[PDB]
């Protein structure tokens, strides 16, 4: 159950989804939780006093933002998503993201094209690390492109 945070209906939906998933063991994801720090504090307090199902998982997608409470940061496990460190890591992540079947279709040239695309991506994104020289500004060349 994926829920975007920011509206009162969103808070009610998140509460209901968590209440049903702690029992059923299903997964709940809440996006952009950094837009409600007080609700984040009360969410951490609610999460502390629970004994959910063994398969229950709550994901909190957020942006690195100092308004995020530190009690939530300590309660949960943090994974930082950022540009890959280099060209090789960028290409590895690109090849991991694309399914194997999608690259390996009936046209045998497709794979090479994909590789070229990956390389091109891995180039331009890395040039973002050199702000004035790589480009004129920090463009958001990302996974959507």
């Amino acid at each position: 159950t994926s829920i975007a945070i920011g509206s009162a209906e969103g808070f009610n939906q998140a509460d209901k989804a968590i209440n049903t998933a702690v029992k059923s063991g299903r997964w709940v994801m809440l996006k952009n939780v950094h837009l409600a720090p007080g609700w984040l504090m009360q969410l951490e307090k609610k999460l502390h006093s629970l004994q959910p199902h063994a398969c229950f998982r709550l994901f909190l997608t957020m942006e690195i933002n100092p308004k995020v409470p530190v009690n939530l940061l300590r309660a949960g496990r943090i994974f930082v998503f950022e540009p890959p460190p280099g060209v090789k890591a960028n290409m590895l992540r690109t090849f991991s993201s694309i399914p194997v079947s999608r690259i390996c279709k009936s046209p045998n040239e497709r794979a090479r094209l994909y590789f070229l695309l990956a390389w091109f991506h891995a180039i331009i994104q890395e040039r973002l690390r050199y702000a004035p020289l790589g480009w004129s500004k920090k463009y958001e060349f990302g996974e959507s492109d």
């Binding site: 829920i3 975007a4 945070i5 920011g6 509206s7 209906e9 969103g10 996006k31 952009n32 837009l35 409600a36 997608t61 942006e63 958001e140 990302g142 996974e143 959507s144």
Partner: protein, 194 residues
């Protein structure tokens, strides 16, 4: 036109961005009129909350009209994040409208809007027009930015516009007149007092 048609075929939205007066709203309206679409222009502000946008989306989906939401980044960031859900649901319904197995003899395609099932016409689209250079404007969440294909509309071709408008209005010397009037405006911008 190329970028927005690419976004439409991918069942995404279109996001022309740039400074004011570059012809973003009019370009979206012109593309909509080129396809014979009912394009509704909305001047968004901080009061365009989740429920108001949901109702507007319901109307657009049922009618099958284009929604050009100008000044989209004037919404609150929490409201933009909340509206991303409705945009994603509408785009999913539009995407499942394009599948070959489903035909118009089956049940109508609906999406989940405002806790109700709303029929989605295939002619509808969502376009957002914004100027990301204004200070104090909201920053779109990435999950909402990924639902739109963006295009930088920063420098309109004033010379060609002036030449064609003067030619179509009956001016026999339209080319010379445009070549005199556009540099004149540039000189007024760069020569008069600020």
């Amino acid at each position: 036109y190329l970028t927005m048609t690419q976004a439409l075929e991918a069942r995404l939205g279109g996001s022309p961005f740039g400074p004011a007066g570059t012809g973003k709203t009019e370009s979206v309206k012109a593309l909509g009129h080129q396809l014979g679409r009912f394009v509704l222009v909305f001047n968004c502000d901080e009061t365009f909350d989740f429920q108001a946008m949901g109702r507007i989306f319901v109307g657009l989906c049922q009618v099958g009209a284009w929604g050009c939401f100008d000044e989209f980044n004037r919404l609150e960031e929490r409201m933009l994040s909340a509206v991303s859900q409705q945009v994603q649901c509408i785009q999913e319904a539009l995407r499942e409208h394009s599948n070959p197995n489903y035909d118009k003899t089956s049940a109508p395609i609906t999406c989940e809007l405002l806790n109700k099932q709303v029929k989605v016409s295939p002619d509808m689209a969502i376009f957002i027009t914004m100027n990301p250079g204004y200070a104090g404007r909201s920053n779109l969440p990435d999950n909402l930015k990924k639902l739109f294909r963006s295009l930088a509309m920063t420098k309109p071709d004033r010379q060609l516009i002036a030449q064609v408008m003067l030619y179509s209005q009956g001016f026999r010397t339209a080319e010379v007149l445009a070549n005199k009037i556009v540099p004149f405006f540039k000189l007024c911008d760069e020569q008069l007092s600020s």
